[PDB]
Structures are given as structure tokens and as C-alpha cells.
Amino acid sequence: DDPVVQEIDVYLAKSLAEKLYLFQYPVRPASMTYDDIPHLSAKIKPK
């Protein structure tokens, strides 16, 4: 099976290695996003 198309390359970015997070809402359909409703307050703990 010879290559056909799109021998795309890959690169690693370390700019945000310690800065990216992934949130997910099990109870919310993906079609209904939260961006429309204004956000007010948030808190976090590092450890």
C-alpha cells in the first residue's frame, strides 16, 4: 500500500505545556454552548 495523499508533518509547541486545560460537561449537549450566557466569577486552586 503506497502513499496516496497528505503526508502531513507534525510539530511540538512548548509555549503552553503547563498552561492548557480541558473542561467537559457530561450533562450538556455539545450543540448547546455556554458562550452566549455571560460569565461572572471563577475560582481555582493550583495544587
Binding site: 497528505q6 503526508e7 502531513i8 511540538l12 498552561k19 473542561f23 467537559q24 457530561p26 455539545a30 450543540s31
Partner: protein, 186 residues
């Protein structure tokens, strides 16, 4: 309570059923769109099946990595985010990290080009990575909302938080074990 009843079994009319049911359910009062009686069509209730959240209207399909990326590049050419999973240890070694055989992970690698992604005839894919190849396959389908966020601890007192976008798909990378066995016979 009646007891003497004459049964009937001779055939009747269908459109009669339809017309009577119409009379019993088609007298709509939907015009009652008062201020307190307004609904946002976006704010409707939901089917439990997230794919079929269409219980009341206004009046996943099989996929493969090669076809998915082909769709991602031909029909549309905008930016997209993907959430992919990697094997426990990459085929590299620590970059003079002073060493137990600690696992080699992307978090401990330098920037720059790292490998190539190949699509071949018949629709199967490998991540050519150095001198080894990792197979790529689709993960479990996703239907709930996922958002990619970057948390900037700008100060020990406070920072800032900005949304980047929402993820849609998953990819899984696994070593090609039988290839390794074939190369290095045992």
C-alpha cells in the same frame, strides 16, 4: 353502569377516525404567545440521546480516520482542534535529563518537527515517528460539550482565563506490536 350492549363489527371509515381525531386535537391555541407564555426555541428541553435532541421540532454515522481527515482538509480548510491519546512511553530517550528508565513523554521533548503522518492506499494510517511507526485509530464517539481553555496564573493573587474553542473528535495512537516482533525475531 350499563350491562346490555349491542356489539358492532361491520367495517367503518378511516378518514372518519382521522377527522374525529382532528376535531379532538387540531383545534390549536398556539396563537397564545403571550409575554409570560414565550419560549426560546434554543432553550428547548432535550432528548436523552444527545445525537437526537429533537423531541419537539419547529413545525453517529460510521467514520474512519482517513475519511475524517479527508473531510477536514478538502470540504473545509479552517482551523480545528483534536484530542489525541499517546502510548505510555515514546520511542525517544530523555534529552540529557540525567536519568530507572523513566518514560519518554512529549512533555520532556524539544520543539521543532518531530515526525510525519502517512496516509496510504486502502485507508490505513501510521504516524512515522523516528525509526518506528505508531498506528492511528478512531476513539469512542463524543457527544457532550468539551471546551479547550488556557489558565494563565498571571499573579500569585489573580490571573486570567480565555476560551480557545471546543473539541469534537478523538484519536488513539498505539504501537504496531506485530511489526516490532517481525523486525526483531524472537
Amino acid at each position: 353502569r350499563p350491562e346490555v350492549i349491542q356489539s358492532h363489527s361491520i367495517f367503518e371509515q378511516g378518514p372518519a377516525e382521522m377527522m374525529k381525531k382532528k376535531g379532538n386535537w387540531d383545534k390549536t391555541v398556539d396563537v397564545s404567545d403571550m409575554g409570560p407564555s414565550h419560549i426560546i426555541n434554543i432553550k428547548k428541553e432535550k432528548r436523552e440521546t444527545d445525537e437526537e435532541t429533537k423531541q419537539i421540532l419547529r413545525m453517529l454515522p460510521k467514520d474512519v480516520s482517513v475519511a475524517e481527515l479527508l473531510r477536514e482538509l478538502s470540504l473545509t480548510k479552517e482551523e480545528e482542534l483534536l484530542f489525541l491519546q499517546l502510548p505510555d512511553t515514546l520511542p525517544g530517550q530523555p534529552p540529557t535529563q540525567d536519568i530507572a528508565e523513566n518514560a519518554c513523554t512529549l512533555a520532556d521533548l524539544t520543539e521543532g518537527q518531530v515526525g510525519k503522518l502517512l496516509i496510504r492506499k486502502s485507508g490505513r494510517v501510521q504516524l512515522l515517528l523516528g525509526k518506528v511507526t505508531l498506528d492511528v485509530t478512531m476513539g469512542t464517539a463524543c457527544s457532550f460539550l468539551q471546551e479547550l481553555v488556557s489558565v494563565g496564573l498571571g499573579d500569585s493573587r489573580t490571573g486570567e482565563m480565555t476560551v480557545l474553542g471546543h473539541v469534537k473528535h478523538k484519536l488513539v495512537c498505539s504501537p504496531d506490536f506485530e511489526s516490532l516482533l517481525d523486525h526483531k525475531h524472537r
